Amino acid sequence: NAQAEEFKKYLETNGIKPKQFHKKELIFNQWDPQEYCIFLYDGITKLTSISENGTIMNLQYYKGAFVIMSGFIDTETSVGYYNLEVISEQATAYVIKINELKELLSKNLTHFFYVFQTLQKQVSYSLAKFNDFSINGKLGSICGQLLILTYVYGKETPDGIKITLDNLTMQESAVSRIISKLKQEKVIVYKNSCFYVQNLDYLKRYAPKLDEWFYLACPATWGKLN
């Protein structure tokens, strides 16, 4: 991705260097008084929050290249008590303190826009998820999630498009029943610990807005299976 490449070069150009991250490490955490702008160049991460009780809730996942900012750009205060945990074996990420990002942004705008538009994809993603769910109930949400996973991780195979995410993350009541429908309907097939798809257009039929969103936000990866 040329645009993502560009951002990676530009920060280094100014004196910032990448950091490597092993699985389970937190690039930032919810108890840090300092907020950070993370440019996740490679690897997979998840956002998590911790309750009073101490239970972990997974709220979202990020694949590189992407930008995750734990603080408001202006006030420098937390946007939410969240942690960014690595779930891939390793991840490379540039960790910028939120007060330092504005100096770089004081210099140039092009790059600033790249980060602005990553938020827009996040915003529209949540809107797309709400719409599909409302339209196609729980069937739409999971097929929505399977289709996104199929667009990003989908590998053409004679058996069907393999969701190339291992058992670790693939395993990460009603959901079991809906999945049984999918397998019964021959839309999905589960061999060698990870789902395969044979009715891509069934997922597309019940998550249409989400399919629209991938087309509008990530038009190259969408091309792969359409």
Partner: peptide, 4 residues
Amino acid sequence: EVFL
């Protein structure tokens, strides 16, 4: 990309 984003998901979930």
